[PDB]
Amino acid sequence: VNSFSGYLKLTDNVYIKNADIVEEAKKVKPTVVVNAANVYLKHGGGVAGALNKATNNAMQVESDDYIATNGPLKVGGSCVLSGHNLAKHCLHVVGPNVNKGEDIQLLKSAYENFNQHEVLLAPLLSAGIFGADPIHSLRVCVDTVRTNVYLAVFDKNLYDKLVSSFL
Numbered sequence: 001v002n003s004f005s006g007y008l009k010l011t012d013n014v015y016i017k018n019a020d021i022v023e024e025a026k027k028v029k030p031t032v033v034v035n036a037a038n039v040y041l042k043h044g045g046g047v048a049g050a051l052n053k054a055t056n057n058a059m060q061v062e063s064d065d066y067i068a069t070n071g072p073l074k075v076g077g078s079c080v081l082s083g084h085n086l087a088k089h090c091l092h093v094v095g096p097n098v099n100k101g102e103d104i105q106l107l108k109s110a111y112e113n114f115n116q117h118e119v120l121l122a123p124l125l126s127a128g129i130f131g132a133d134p135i136h137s138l139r140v141c142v143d144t145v146r147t148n149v150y151l152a153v154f155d156k157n158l159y160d161k162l163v164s165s166f167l
């Protein structure tokens with residue numbers, strides 16, 4: 001049993017809810033929240049900007065030190081950093097950004113990072129300002145992630161379309 005409430009069950013291991021991931025993290029304090037990161041961990045907008053704002057910029061400060069030491073992530077890659085006030089850990093995952101011309105086949109590699117964690121609160125990778133089709137992102141998630149994933153989708157219209165169209 002876990003703390004996650006109000007989710008629709010899509011599969012054995014994937015759950016979905018219309019929710020602001022920031023407000024959900026604040027309520028649950030999950031072991032892992034996933035950030036929709038870029039390779040530079042520059043948390044300007046989208047999910048990353050919202051998560052970072054909720055940490056009062058502490059996520060960005062920590063991320064800048066990580067990049068100064070390690071250099072950029074790979075598209076499809078990830079790193080584990082602090083969850084600050086939102087979670088124990090933040091898994092920063094880089095999905096391909098279609099608005100930069102990145103290979104959508106890297107979306108499966110991105111979701112494979114989730115399998116290193118037994119339970120996660122996450123957004124749909126490569127959705128929103130990363131430009132991919134969220135219906136496709138949900139299909140790759142279900143067909144790739146084997147651990148227990150709680151997906152938070154703030155847009156209500158999109159949430160209803162994802163559920164209604166789910167095979």
Ligand SMILES: Nc1n[nH]c2ccccc12
Nearest residue numbers: 020021046047152153154
């Ligand atoms: N699914 C989401 N929860 N919170 C967000 C903030 C920005 C973009 C997407 C989300």
